Amino acid sequence: NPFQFYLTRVSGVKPKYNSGALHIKDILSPLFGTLVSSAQFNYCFDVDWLVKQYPPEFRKKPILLVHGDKREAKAHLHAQAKPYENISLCQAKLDIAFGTHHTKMMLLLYEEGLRVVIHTSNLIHADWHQKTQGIWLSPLYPRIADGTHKSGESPTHFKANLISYLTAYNAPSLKEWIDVIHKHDLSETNVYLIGSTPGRFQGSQKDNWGHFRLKKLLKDHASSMSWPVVGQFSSVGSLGADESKWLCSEFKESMLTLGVPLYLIYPSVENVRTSLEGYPAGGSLPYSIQTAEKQNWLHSYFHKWSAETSGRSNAMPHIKTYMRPSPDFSKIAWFLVTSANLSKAAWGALEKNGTQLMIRSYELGVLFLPSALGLDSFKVKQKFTFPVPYDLPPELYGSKDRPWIWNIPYVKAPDTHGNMWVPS
Ligand SMILES: NC[C@@H](O)c1ccc(O)cc1
Numbered sequence: 001n002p003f004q005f006y007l008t009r010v011s012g013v014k015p016k017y018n019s020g021a022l023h024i025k026d027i028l029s030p031l032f033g034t035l036v037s038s039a040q041f042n043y044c045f046d047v048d049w050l051v052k053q054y055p056p057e058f059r060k061k062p063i064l065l066v067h068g069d070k071r072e073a074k075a076h077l078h079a080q081a082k083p084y085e086n087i088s089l090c091q092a093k094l095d096i097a098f099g100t101h102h103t104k105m106m107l108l109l110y111e112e113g114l115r116v117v118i119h120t121s122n123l124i125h126a127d128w129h130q131k132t133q134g135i136w137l138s139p140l141y142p143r144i145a146d147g148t149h150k151s152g153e154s155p156t157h158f159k160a161n162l163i164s165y166l167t168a169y170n171a172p173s174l175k176e177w178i179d180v181i182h183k184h185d186l187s188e189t190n191v192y193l194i195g196s197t198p199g200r201f202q203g204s205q206k207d208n209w210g211h212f213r214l215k216k217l218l219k220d221h222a223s224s225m226s227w228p229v230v231g232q233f234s235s236v237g238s239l240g241a242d243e244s245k246w247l248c249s250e251f252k253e254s255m256l257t258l259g260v261p262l263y264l265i266y267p268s269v270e271n272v273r274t275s276l277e278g279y280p281a282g283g284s285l286p287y288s289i290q291t292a293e294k295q296n297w298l299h300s301y302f303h304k305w306s307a308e309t310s311g312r313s314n315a316m317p318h319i320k321t322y323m324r325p326s327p328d329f330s331k332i333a334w335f336l337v338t339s340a341n342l343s344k345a346a347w348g349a350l351e352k353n354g355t356q357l358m359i360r361s362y363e364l365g366v367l368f369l370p371s372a373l374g375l376d377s378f379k380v381k382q383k384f385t386f387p388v389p390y391d392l393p394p395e396l397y398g399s400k401d402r403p404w405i406w407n408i409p410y411v412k413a414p415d416t417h418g419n420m421w422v423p424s
Contacts, residue, residue: 002190002373005337007389008121008133010315012276017311020384022135024053024128027117033110033140039064039177041105041364044122047080047087064173066090068101068362090173092362096198099360102339102346103195107177114141114184116162118366120319120339130276131284132305132312132389134319134337136191136366141184152185156372159186161193164208165364168197190372192217194338196346196363206357210348214336214367215254221371222334224258226327230394231255232265233320236287236403237343242297250350255322258333263394264301264342267316268401269410271305274314278415281316285404292405299403303394310384319389320365329392331377338365 009023028035035058040050045067051059063086069077074091081087092101106117116138121127144152153159163181166174194217196210207216229252240246252262267275267285275281292299307313320341324333340346345360368386370377378386397403410421 003368003386004137005387006135006137007310008128008131008135010312011129013311027106028054028058030055030057033108033112033115035061035108035110037062037109039066039107040123041066041103042123043100043102043104044124045077045080046124047084049125050123051084060086063087064090066092066101068092068094088173090171092169092171094198096360098345099198101362103362103364104339105364109180112140113143114180118364120337127284127318130315132307132315132317132319134321134389136337139188141186143183144185150185152187154187154189156189156192158189158191158193165193165195165197191366191368194336194365194367196340196348196359196361198360198362200351201357202355210357210359211251211254212348212357215257217367218257218334219259221369222258223376227324227333228261228263228327229255230263230265230323230325231342232317232322232390233341234285234318235341235343236266236291237345238291239295239298239344246344246349247298251347262301263303265303265305265390265394267305267404268397269404270401272316272404273410273413273415275316275416276314277316278417278419279410279421282404282406282421284318285316286406287403288407289405292403299397302397302403304397304401305390306395307390309382309391310389312389325380325392329380331379332386333370333377335368335378335386336365339363340365
């Protein structure tokens with residue numbers, strides 16, 4: 001299995017739909033390695049829940065929580081962590097307004113080597129219960145023979161790129177993790193890292209992050225052969241007064257690069273209303289009416305969440321994926337799973353007449369390119385060749401459909417659990 005791409009377990013579907021799926025308890029189990037230390041990068045944390053996901057034998061090993069919380073929220077997290085002597089925190093600097101530390105990553109240092117997990121789930125129970133979420137699992141990276149001279153680098157430059165990503169935090173506690181990574185052999189890695197980090201980037205530095213990083217990799221490591229672009233996500237930023245301001249101009253321009261129909265997949269109200277969670281699934285789909293009302297034009301690109309292929313049409317998506325399928329959707333030129341939602345905050349926007357890329361947040365994903373496996377393209381696995389986790393082709397919103405908008409009421413029809421939704 002060359003991809004090592006997994007979905008999280010969903011409670012309450014037929015067990016057949018959880019056969020190749022992973023819960024965090026599985027990821028942290030002793031079968032995966034004898035744990036010594038770990039770092040947990042994320043956005044939201046429930047510390048009591050998190051510690052419980054570790055096997056009892058490992059619960060006292062050091063854990064570093066990497067977060068972006070400030071003021072009172074930061075206070076709250078420290079309070080959550082206080083009781084656990086083995087837990088340290090690293091506040092990632094967020095010097096730009098409206099940025100978040102949104103990266104979901106685990107660094108797992110074992111007696112036997114090192115593992116990197118890049119995923120989409122917050123570290124709270126509900127994100128691992130009945131949502132569609134995605135995971136990439138690195139191989140077990142061995143320590144470099146303490147007596148030999150090797151880079152430990154892969155053809156995709158994953159090791160150097162991961163170090164550069166951690167270096168951007170400028171954080172004492174991560175330097176230690178950087179040193180650990182230095183000591184291991186990551187040469188078997190066959191994916192490319194795509195990161196976002198907060199800043200304003202000029203010239204050559206523009207290629208390092210966000211959608212320009214993606215553009216760069218697609219220019220260099222894909223070849224060009226009407227192949228649509230698909231974007232799928234759970235949060236929607238303010239994209240501008242029309243499609244030409246950002247979405248179709250710089251964003252789509254990066255996505256269609258190689259060596260055009262745009263499908264966007266975002267749950268409708270109906271998708272949410274009849275999900276396994278009902279309306280409260282919408283708590284993790286924070287599209288606000290203030291944003292939506294500025295950009296009604298966007299919604300003509302929206303397609304319903306549908307995942308009969310994975311038994312997950314009723315498990316609302318918190319995964320974010322981007323991809324480039326062929327005209328008949330039977331193959332893809334590339335696939336990306338990442339933390340990055342559909343916002344300029346996450347992906348970058350051009351400033352100062354296009355000489356500067358502004359990114360607000362930390363984001364992280366892995367790009368699957370056929371060239372890294374010695375191929376031109378991947379055939380799509382039609383029944384969860386690349387395991388695309390939702391149905392193709394994507395289905396357009398019907399005429400009575402609306403995008404899920406979190407902060408308005410839904411009181412005309414009850415959800416799965418016989419409840420209404422009145423946010424306030
Ligand atoms: N702000 C916390 C809550 O609204 C939330 C947190 C994480 C998400 O991915 C979506 C929503």
